[PDB]
Write a protein that binds this ligand. Structure first.
Ligand SMILES: [Mg+2]
Ligand SMILES: [Mg+2]
Ligand SMILES: [Mg+2]
Ligand SMILES: [Mg+2]
Ligand SMILES: [Mg+2]
Ligand SMILES: [Mg+2]
Ligand SMILES: [Mg+2]
Ligand SMILES: [Mg+2]
Ligand SMILES: [Mg+2]
Ligand SMILES: [Mg+2]
Ligand SMILES: [Mg+2]
Ligand SMILES: [Mg+2]
Ligand SMILES: [Mg+2]
Ligand SMILES: [Mg+2]
Ligand SMILES: [Mg+2]
Ligand SMILES: [Mg+2]
Ligand SMILES: [Mg+2]
Ligand SMILES: [Mg+2]
Ligand SMILES: [Mg+2]
Ligand SMILES: [Mg+2]
Ligand SMILES: [Zn+2]
Lengths: 37, 213, 174, 58, 146
RNA sequence: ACCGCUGAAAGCAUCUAAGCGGGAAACCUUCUCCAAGAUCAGGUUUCUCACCCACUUGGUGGGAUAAGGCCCCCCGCAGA
RNA sequence: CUCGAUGUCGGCUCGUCGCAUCCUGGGGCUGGAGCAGGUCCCAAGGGUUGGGCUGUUCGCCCAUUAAAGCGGCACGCGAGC
């Protein structure tokens, strides 16, 4: 996981959601997932 | 499950085991005990059993304590202590007036021994808490066994509670865990327990079957 | 759109409604449920199930489809249960059924044993294929996931436990 | 305040209503009355309530 | 001279407040007012007027879920690093009456009278109290429309 | 932290919004010690369970006892 | 602020706290085959060596170690040396 104050999708298939009051990106490619922090 | 007995520390000696290894043991005369009382959860709020140990002249017991013993129909003893059982009574395994001897334990089992450690009087920090002190030479002035600093400075302008200083040492309640019962001599009512036991020779000792085992 | 559908009743032998609560029994055992407050469960013209709620609120549009699909899953499972098929990969990795429990050989020094809880029945077909069965979809999925995570993912060789037809990621490494 | 709320009215509206009714007794004697003669205090509360406007939010 | 209560004028009574769905703050304010006796026209700030209050069903008080999760209770033992810390959730599981009485006591004046005023408070987790011999009247919370 | 199951808003998907799991020497019980001056001063028991005088007749002042202590005496591996 | 006085570096003794974590504990990603690692997230319970040189702090070196953490407290601590 990447943890940076700015998160945004990288490739075309990165979805961007917000679970438990925290913005994060989930994607099939495991090295793409990010969460704000 | 929890088994207990009251006895007297008779001193230490050594024996040799089957491997021809020397074993330092403490001789505990786990003499006969009488029950004298049962604590039920319904009446007291917890489950436990009193135990009476030690011989004493009946003229040495006042009227209230004598009445308590008479209520149980037992001749008065010197000592009296409660063995706390698990929060389940099971309402069994103990009768008032029943006798407990030393062979409630068996060879090779483990016990917890609690007693009253020896008194050391007013002790310094070097003995009581293992402080280092300052050096014996190179200019040290009258501080060889003194404690050193006891706090900070203007912040905080106080000494913290629980700072270790000199004071009375010993006479505490001490429990030693996982002592191996080397031999149970039922003839003399004697337990040979491998290791050391808190207290002076002749002091009251409580022996309990170990819970850590 | 989900939640704006009636729930058909193949059997629904003992469909009962008591203050946002419901119980359904049939060819298999019974299953209960309590519906969220702003949702109303009611009957259709053909004895079916329908749910409703006051219109156009975020908290109600969210609960609508959820409460619909939960009772739909419940009745579906009562009619026919849920089964999940799981494979095993890797040389020497295998599974056997030991009474009510289920044993795994997954390269550990010790063996791994999974006990089946109530309402769940295991069934082995081949030394490398088995199936977890039950009526409650959530419980079946939970047990399947517990069995799924028995080994850490292996992108290089691929050994471990997988679902049927799932495509795990692969890397070459050396 | 205690006596008024016992007679089901706030000190707030009791003072407004007494001034509207044109009663010029001061607080020392109102408190004295509340301690000594609760029937008279109830009568005063009735007068204040009667003189108070019908809707107090207009 | 304005009236000042004399020794022997104060008359006490017994109230029982049910905490089934009352929120903690409302219940605490009500109990504090009853204990101090501010509802009595004979009130005096230097006199321990007021009544006895029995609070039952202390485990039913309405506490928000986020408050159970996040409202935190602190005690310092006096030793370095001796700040110990619980949640309202753990307290409500273990000693529910302590939560109610702590909330009530925070709302009393911080002086010597409140030490004696808090002696008249009884809080119970269950639905029953042992003071049946005293005949406490039920007390529901009212708000005076204005 | 992280990994999930079931699952809408948003016909798909989503660990989450309803709900249910796994998860660390940190936290709480469990082990050891202190502790009812815990002034909400706790509990289970057992013993004494009794008088006299004065008086402004008082939840009054004195006097003498019980159960039980204390001081004194002989000591201690208890101890300034 | 303190000049009708608030003792100044280093060492010793005794500590206490923070976490921006050195080890041990838990994880995600990896240009992670395995052993080893890199990076980021969680985590402050305990631990965190002895010497040579220099007044030294610092630093370098020697021999080990799971590791030889960084800081605050009048650059903690002279009515304690
Ligand atoms: Mg020395
Ligand atoms: Mg000198
Ligand atoms: Mg000198
Ligand atoms: Mg000297
Ligand atoms: Mg200070
Ligand atoms: Mg999913
Ligand atoms: Mg205290
Ligand atoms: Mg100066
Ligand atoms: Mg001066
Ligand atoms: Mg951190
Ligand atoms: Mg890593
Ligand atoms: Mg490699
Ligand atoms: Mg630590
Ligand atoms: Mg701990
Ligand atoms: Mg330091
Ligand atoms: Mg300094
Ligand atoms: Mg000096
Ligand atoms: Mg110095
Ligand atoms: Mg100084
Ligand atoms: Mg000074
Ligand atoms: Zn992606």
């Amino acid at each position: 996981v990447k943890v940076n104050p700015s998160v945004k999708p990288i490739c075309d298939k990165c979805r961007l959601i917000r679970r438990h009051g925290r913005v994060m990106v989930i994607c099939s490619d495991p090295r793409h997932k990010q969460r704000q922090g | 499950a929890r088994k207990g007995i009251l006895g007297t520390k008779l001193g230490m000696t050594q024996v040799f085991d089957e491997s021809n290894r020397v074993v330092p043991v403490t001789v505990v005369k786990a003499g006969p005990n009488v029950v004298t009382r049962i604590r039920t959860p319904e009446r007291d709020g917890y489950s436990a059993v009193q135990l009476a140990y030690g011989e004493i002249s009946p003229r040495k017991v006042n009227k209230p304590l004598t009445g308590q013993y008479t209520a149980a129909g037992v001749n008065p003893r010197r000592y009296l202590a409660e063995l706390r059982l698990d929060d389940s009574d099971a309402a069994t395994e103990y009768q008032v007036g029943q006798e407990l001897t030393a062979e409630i334990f068996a060879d090779g089992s483990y016990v917890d021994v609690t007693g009253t450690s020896k008194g050391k009087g007013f002790a310094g920090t070097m003995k009581r808490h293992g402080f280092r002190g300052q050096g014996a030479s190179h200019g040290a002035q009258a501080v060889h066994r003194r404690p050193g600093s006891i706090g900070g400075c203007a912040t905080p302008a106080r000494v913290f509670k629980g700072t270790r200083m000199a004071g009375r040492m010993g006479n505490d309640r001490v429990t030693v865990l996982n002592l191996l019962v080397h031999k149970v001599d039922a003839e003399n009512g004697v337990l040979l327990i491998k290791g050391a036991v808190p207290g002076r020779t002749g002091g009251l000792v409580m022996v309990r079957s170990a819970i850590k085992r | 759109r989900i939640g704006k559908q009636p729930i058909p009743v193949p059997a629904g032998v003992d469909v009962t409604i008591e203050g946002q609560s419901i119980s359904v029994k049939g060819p298999k055992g019974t299953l209960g449920l309590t519906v969220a407050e702003p949702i109303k469960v009611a009957r259709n013209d053909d004895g079916a199930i329908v749910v409703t709620r006051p219109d156009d609120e975020r908290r109600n549009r969210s609960l609508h489809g959820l409460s619909r699909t939960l009772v739909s899953n419940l009745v579906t499972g009562v009619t026919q249960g849920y089964t999940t098929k799981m494979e095993i990969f890797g040389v020497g990795y295998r599974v056997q059924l030991k009474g009510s429990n289920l044993e795994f050989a997954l390269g550990y020094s010790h063996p791994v044993v999974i006990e089946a809880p109530e309402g769940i029945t295991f069934a082995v077909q081949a030394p490398t294929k088995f199936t977890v069965s039950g009526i409650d979809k959530q419980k079946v999925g939970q047990i399947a996931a517990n069995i799924r995570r028995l080994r850490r993912p292996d992108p290089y060789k691929g050994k471990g436990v997988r679902y049927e037809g799932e495509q795990i990621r692969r890397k070459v490494g050396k | 305040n205690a006596a008024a709320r016992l007679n089901d009215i706030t000190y707030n509206r009791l003072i407004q209503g007494l001034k509207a009714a044109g009663v010029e007794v001061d607080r020392k004697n109102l408190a004295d009355i509340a301690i000594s003669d609760p029937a008279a205090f109830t009568a005063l509360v009735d007068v204040a309530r009667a003189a108070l406007p019908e809707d107090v939010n207009a | 001279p304005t009236y000042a209560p004399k020794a022997g004028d104060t008359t006490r009574s017994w109230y029982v407040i049910d905490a089934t769905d009352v929120v903690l703050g409302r219940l605490a304010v009500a109990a504090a007012n009853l204990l101090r006796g501010k509802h009595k026209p004979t009130f005096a700030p230097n006199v321990d007027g007021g009544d006895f209050v029995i609070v039952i069903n202390a485990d039913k008080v309405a506490i928000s879920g986020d408050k159970l999760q996040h409202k935190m209770v602190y005690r310092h033992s006096g030793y370095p690093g001796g700040l110990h810390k619980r949640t309202i959730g753990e307290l409500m599981q273990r000693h529910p009456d302590r939560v109610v009485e702590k909330a009530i006591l925070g709302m009393l004046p911080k002086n010597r009278l409140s030490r004696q005023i808090q002696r008249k408070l009884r809080v119970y987790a269950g639905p029953e109290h042992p003071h049946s011999a005293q005949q406490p009247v039920p007390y529901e919370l009212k708000q005076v429309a204005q």
